[PDB]
Ligand binder design. Structure first.
Ligand SMILES: Cc1cc2nc3c(=O)[nH]c(=O)nc-3n(C[C@H](O)[C@H](O)[C@H](O)COP(=O)(O)O)c2cc1C
Ligand SMILES: Cc1cc2nc3c(=O)[nH]c(=O)nc-3n(C[C@H](O)[C@H](O)[C@H](O)COP(=O)(O)O)c2cc1C
Lengths: 438, 437
């Protein structure tokens, strides 16, 4: 049907199920960096886009839904991020409720460690038996995971004790709960690898045998993909669809500042490094960020090293304490904590007043939200503090398109770079088959 | 025709130039772990083998050359490691001199940060002008590198100020130095591991810039222990590949049976990083076998102490007692005295003046000692064995689990090489057909 080589790549049922032309998804990016504009542009070009709900209010998310639906008037598929946080399980439930009320039938579920009541409610709500014997699934889930045991949890049906409970509470009907037993929690697993693939594929096959699901759950890959070569490698290793992230932040459509994008355009492969994440600061979770020309990585790492050794804010020696206040924060510890009193819940403050360790993290965490805010806002002339999440994939992309019309991010459109990546990926793949069988 | 699928992989001129059937090399492994016997077995099977000269005497290396040549009597190609050390600059020069004096026309050049006088001497010596105006290159170099700027240095001709100097000193003739201007430093770059596709563009850029007659190929090494890994490398544009870890666990490898017994049981997750002896101070790290072994933690500890204190005395008596009793089984004083016997007066002199260097020198004993423990079959305590190894071996082990190849005593370096390349070829063709169908 006039479909290009790029469109032939990856699993056919994946493309059919989501009514898309490419086995390709743009991954969520928090605080709307994966913007309404981006999701709309991706949907209209026949690929999968997810809106970045991370760290936005329910009211704001609902506003995003309305805008996207209004612009998508040919039944184009699109998705919403559902980002798990250990501390705020009610935000997730409220997000699901918003999704159910507003027609959201596709989510990217990420950072989950296992299956939650909210996910089960979403998966099972609306389930009905078709006359032809099949299960009518209203609400689809693409689970983004890095760990086999989380993948496995998603390849299994909704756990029975959660269903039983939700039926008791009249959240699900017995019929919905019965139907939920014979389908997996996720329709697709996006394996995020920022060598794991064959293990996940073997795990998938085992789970298909074990449960005898009617429809195969596909396994895709994301992480490190910014070039035709990287994408080709992912498909060789068994990816049945692929996802990108870093390259999409550096486009016209991305919901971040022009200054951020200017920085991102100049990134090379070596220009990123690891730094702690705000929302998982204590645990020691780390994420990749832009390094070249920026102080944030060193500074964020420093604050973790101080949390690590001392047990309170007072314990910090006055010379570094003066460093943090004057250079990092441009604010005193006291000033920060008082600002935090305004923002946070009384319960959280109370918890900090009793615990000097928690009070410390709480104050350092301000740096992360502050620097994120600085980045999103175009304003600061000092770019030195900008927290910018980014992997080497972008660096690779930049080198790929060096000296091209695509070099300037103002000519980079999320749907077009997506298309070109997939078409060139396809050509590269075919070209190699020519080479080795010649 | 009559070439297997495995032999078709990679760049054809790479295979032609080195008169081999596979675009495949076994990497050097120090102290003769890449043994004469291994290099011979690889050469006879139409692949590239490099002898592990690292940490051996010039006399020992010269003896290795003789043994290898005698067994290779059909003009089979083989190579020698040239391992750069910042502080043994004369060993390199003497190694080059030995290579020139003997039949060595191929080296694997590794750990170089840029181009040195010794490398230029090697490259430029044999040079002759061909009748057609082209440069006849006698002495070939495969540069193993991780950094773009080092690769670039190798993709460039011998730097002019080094040539000019060597001519002045009558090490090179003006003719040799002239010819050297129009050929690159290396014939091949083995990129040691997203860097892959980047390096290829850099190569192309350098080809355009200098218009070399022969293309410099770009290959890949690191993490390759299975058909999948090897298939991925070629798909990503590798024009040849090199392996290391999988070869240490073969009959031919020059290390102890007990080391190989440990290696046979390795899984992907059973390795970690530890500092390297020869580049201890700089903070260079290398991958080693971890599971069941104390060496990694202990080697790391010693670096943390070098990092922090500025002398041996400064170490608190409780950790000082740990190191002496458990790590070394010897006192600091006993070690230093042993070192006086071994090392050059010049090195002792430097330690006597500098307490920082004296410390490293003493900690470095641990590395040479544990390396020796591994090479020798003897110690029943395997706990201190320094064994270099990456996850590639773990992957290989899982690949051959429950097969005749499971026992390392049935693992031959040439045969696992062949099998890897043949299966790599089959995997690529079968999957590319599937994926583009
Ligand atoms: C700036 C940025 C923000 C991101 N935010 C989220 C997020 O909020 N939730 C989520 O599940 N993934 C998030 N991701 C991950 C991407 O969706 C995608 O999975 C990942 O970036 C793929 O890795 P790659 O950049 O190497 O292509 C984010 C990535 C970036 C670069
Ligand atoms: C035990 C061992 C010793 C090695 N010794 C050297 C060496 O002396 N000089 C060198 O350039 N590379 C040395 N290497 C690196 C290998 O030549 C090869 O490049 C590398 O192991 C390939 O990575 P892989 O193990 O993932 O296959 C050594 C590797 C191992 C495993």
């Amino acid at each position: 049907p006039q479909k290009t080589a790029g469109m032939r790549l990856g699993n056919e049922d994946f493309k059919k199920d989501y009514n898309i032309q490419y086995a390709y998804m743009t991954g969520s990016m928090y605080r709307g960096i994966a913007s309404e504009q981006m999701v709309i542009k991706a949907a209209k070009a026949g690929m999968l886009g997810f809106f970045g709900t991370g760290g936005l209010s329910i009211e704001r998310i609902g506003q995003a839904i309305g805008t996207i639906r209004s612009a998508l008037r040919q039944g184009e598929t699109f998705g919403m991020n559902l980002l798990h946080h250990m501390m705020s399980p009610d935000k997730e439930v409220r997000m699901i409720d918003l999704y159910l009320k507003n027609g959201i039938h596709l989510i990217e579920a990420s950072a989950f460690m296992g299956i939650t009541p909210a996910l089960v409610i979403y998966r099972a709500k609306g389930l009905s038996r078709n006359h032809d014997g099949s299960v009518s699934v209203q609400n689809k889930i693409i689970a983004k995971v890095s760990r086999p045991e989380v993948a496995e949890a998603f390849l299994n049906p909704a756990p029975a004790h959660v269903l039983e409970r939700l039926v008791s509470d009249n959240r699900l009907t017995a019929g919905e709960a019965a139907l939920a037993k014979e389908i997996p929690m996720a329709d697709d697993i996006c394996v995020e690898a920022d060598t794991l693939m064959p293990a996940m594929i073997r795990l998938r096959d085992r789970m298909m045998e074990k449960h005898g699901y009617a429809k195969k759950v596909r396994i895709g890959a994301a992480g490190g993909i910014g070039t035709p070569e990287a994408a080709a490698a992912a498909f060789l290793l068994g990816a049945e669809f692929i996802g990108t992230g870093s390259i999409n932040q550096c486009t016209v459509e991305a919901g971040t500042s022009d200054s951020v994008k200017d920085l991102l355009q100049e990134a090379n492969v070596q220009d990123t490094s690891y730094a702690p994440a705000g929302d998982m600061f204590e645990a020691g979770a780390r994420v990749q960020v832009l390094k070249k020309g920026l102080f944030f990585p060193a500074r964020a790492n420093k604050l973790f090293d101080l949390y690590r050794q001392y047990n309170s804010l007072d314990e910090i020696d006055e010379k570094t304490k003066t460093l943090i206040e004057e250079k990092y924060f441009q604010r005193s510890f006291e000033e920060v904590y008082e600002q935090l009193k305004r923002d946070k819940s009384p319960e959280q403050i109370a918890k900090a007043e009793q615990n000097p360790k928690h009070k410390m993290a709480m104050v350092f965490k301000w740096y992360f939200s502050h620097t994120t805010r600085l980045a999103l806002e175009g304003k600061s002339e000092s770019k030195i503090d900008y927290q910018i999440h980014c992997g080497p994939a972008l660096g690779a992309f930049n080198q790929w398109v060096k000296g091209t019309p695509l070099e300037n991010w103002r000519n980079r459109h999320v749907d077009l770079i997506g298309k070109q990546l997939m078409e060139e990926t396809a050509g590269l793949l075919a070209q190699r088959l020519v080479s080795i069988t010649g």
